[PDB]
Amino acid sequence: SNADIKPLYCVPASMTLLFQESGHKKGSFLEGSEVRTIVINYAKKNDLVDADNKNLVRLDPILCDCILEKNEQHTVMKLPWDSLLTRCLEKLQPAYQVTLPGQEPIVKKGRICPIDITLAQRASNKKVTVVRNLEAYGLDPYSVAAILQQRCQASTTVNPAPGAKDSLQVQIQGNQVHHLGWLLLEEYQLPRKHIQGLEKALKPG
Numbered sequence: 001s002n003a004d005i006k007p008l009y010c011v012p013a014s015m016t017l018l019f020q021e022s023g024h025k026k027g028s029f030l031e032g033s034e035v036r037t038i039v040i041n042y043a044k045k046n047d048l049v050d051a052d053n054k055n056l057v058r059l060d061p062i063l064c065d066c067i068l069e070k071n072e073q074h075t076v077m078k079l080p081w082d083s084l085l086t087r088c089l090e091k092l093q094p095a096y097q098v099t100l101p102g103q104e105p106i107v108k109k110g111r112i113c114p115i116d117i118t119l120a121q122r123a124s125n126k127k128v129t130v131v132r133n134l135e136a137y138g139l140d141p142y143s144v145a146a147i148l149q150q151r152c153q154a155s156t157t158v159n160p161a162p163g164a165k166d167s168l169q170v171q172i173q174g175n176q177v178h179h180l181g182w183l184l185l186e187e188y189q190l191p192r193k194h195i196q197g198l199e200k201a202l203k204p205g
């Protein structure tokens with residue numbers, strides 16, 4: 001199938017008491033729909049829904065501790081579902097899941113960024129194609145480099161990339177943006193919105 005990128009939420013230590021009944025512990029990964037279900041179940045099971053307004057949840061000490069701010073601790077007594085749920089989601093750790101065609105899903109902590117393709121102008125009219133953030137998608141830069149050497153019939157290297165430690169970029173001699181289009185869009189079937197820099201291609205390919 002097409003590559004799948006799915007947002008996830010990771011349970012921090014501060015929210016383990018809320019998630020206890022659900023069976024999830026610190027470090028569990030959840031989809032947003034599961035979080036909603038768990039929080040609604042919590043409010044119901046603990047009889048926290050307001051008798052006179054079903055849109056409202058009275059906060060117990062567990063909810064007060066993990067989703068209220070410090071300036072709200074002894075002030076806000078009830079929250080509507082919309083606020084309660086949004087707060088719960090924001091307190092969880094951001095994460096995501098990438099499923100490349102024919103592969104098992106790879107889980108990642110943090111927020112997804114696109115693969116970034118740039119052209120670097122060197123020597124005399126000699127360009128180099130630079131490809132960054134492959135690892136964010138579970139792609140091995142050395143494998144990508146080897147594939148592109150075959151595809152582009154041009155020399156590839158893997159080199160350190162700016163930013164975080166041990167980050168890598170693939171460099172290909174010449175202007176090869178169109179071949180990255182082939183590799184990422186066709187071979188790995190990644191959604192177009194996860195790639196930056198294809199607008200720099202010589203030809204649509």
